[model samples]
Target: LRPRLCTMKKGPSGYGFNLHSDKSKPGQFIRSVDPDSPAEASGLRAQDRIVEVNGVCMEGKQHGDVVSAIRAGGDETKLLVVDRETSTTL
Candidate 1:
């Protein structure tokens, strides 16, 4: 289940999360996080699959498409992620 919501602010407030994407899955994962990155501050960690961007459902969406939406979110690029290997009933 989803245990956390990462509401990150980029630009004025904000984002590499070392996003990971591949041929087998349309989902994006947090490959890694830098110590000083906004993602790190928001409690992002490796292997977290992004569930949504800015309250938009990312199901069946491509990685680039999510990026566009994230950028379009103005100064706040909110994200909801889950540990893929866990029971995500949330």
Candidate 2:
């Protein structure tokens, strides 16, 4: 699976995506990509697995910490993500 880098600028409706995780999963996940939103425009899709926030590795990181990192970027946030289904083969 290829990792895509999405540069999302905070819109009026926030990032236009939600971060969610399941108890059975490890890292955070991208979900609910809104129509015509920044996250969608940046090519982020539902169920994408987050690999990094900005340049920081997200392995073993908590959800709150990931949110903090995104907010810390202010207007713009850079995300490194992989397709959930594609990643399952790894």
Candidate 3:
């Protein structure tokens, strides 16, 4: 966990970020943060479990659903991420 692997943040604006589905997992995970994208500036990281998007819960949503929701959220999307390192840190 570098800097803040887990964080509650907003945006994907400008260049945005990347995401991937892990069949072994229960929800969608953030794969990468585009350089200078909202994710990078906001400290989102690879493997951060997306707990929510905007105001909706992402825990039970499909990969496509999550992606669509995030896209639909546009530039002002809010994300709630969960990572092990963040468990003990802000």
Candidate 4:
């Protein structure tokens, strides 16, 4: 039994953020990108791990927090660093 958030799910290899992981590396993966979403327009792809949002590393954050951050608009551009790696071979 572990602490759980209502909205977190284990998505595909290159998908949603894992609710449970080492706090030191709380990175979330991009699952499905909306066609007209800011993330898609920015060239973010599925399986891309988001290490930081707006220069802030997302570690030990709730799923909602991540979503909020993405929706939190500032300038015309949002900087997101993605790790392009496939964890499995299929």
Candidate 5:
């Protein structure tokens, strides 16, 4: 699968999204992307599986690990993601 790089610039409301992990899944997924928020602006879609966070691989990472990496990314974070289903790749 082709991964899209989404650069999120945190707003006053923070990232404005939720991250979720499934025990059967390989990585973290975007649980939600609030309207008019940084996540929406960054093109981060709900259910998009996160591949990397700020250049740190998310493979085999737990929910907490993914959250920690995002937090350490400061005001902005770069995310590599792919569709959860058969959808657009680029």
Candidate 6:
């Protein structure tokens, strides 16, 4: 699933994911949630990292894929585990 384009741009830091540098593997994190987006309305927020999607680890997935997943879920409130320190989901 994919998030609506409006949702991507209207949020706090926008729908773009944040990237973190790591020795083992470079990873992405969700630094902030769009205040006006469903994610935020559903309780997601800045510094909340996304760890998994529908029970799948986000290890090698593309950013677009993740967005698609969120979008596919629509307005439903789905759980996304987070890594708050590095702002990554996993």
TM values, all candidates? 0.80, 0.90, 0.71, 0.49, 0.88, 0.48
Give the Cα error of residue 11 in candidate 5, in Å. 1.1
| Model 4 whole-model lDDT (C-alpha atoms) | 0.48
- As a TM-score, model 5 comes out at 0.88
lDDT of 2 at 38: 91
Pick by TM-score: 1 or 4, better one: 1
Q: After superposition, how far is residue 57 of candidate 4 from its true place, in Å?
A: 1.2
| Candidate 6 lDDT over residue span 1-90, tens digit each | 322112222344434334333444434455655445555565555545456655556667766776676666544424455544435476
**Winner by TM-score:** 2
- TM-score for candidate 1, please give it: 0.80
lDDT string for model 5 (1-90, tens) is 579999989999998999888667678888899999989998899989999998888898888999999999889999999987675669
Better of 1 and 3 by TM-score: 1
* Candidate 6: Cα lDDT at 42: 56
The residue-by-residue lDDT of candidate 2 on 1-89, one tens digit each, is 68989998898889899899866879999767999999999999988988999989999988998889899999999999988663345
lDDT of 4 by residue, 6-60 (tens): 1211223322222223344456665556555444555656655555565666666
Cα lDDT for residue 82, model 3?
A: 77
lDDT of 4 at 85: 44
Mind sharing the TM-score for model 3? 0.71
Question: lDDT of all the models against the reference?
Answer: 0.78, 0.89, 0.69, 0.48, 0.89, 0.49
* Pairs that clash in candidate 3: none
User: Which tens-of-lDDT digit does each residue in 1-90 have in candidate 3?
Assistant: 432333234543543577888877688877778776666777787778888777678778888998898768554667778773435455
| Ten residues in sequence with the least summed lDDT for candidate 5 | 80-89
**Candidate 3: worst 10 consecutive residues by lDDT?**
1-10
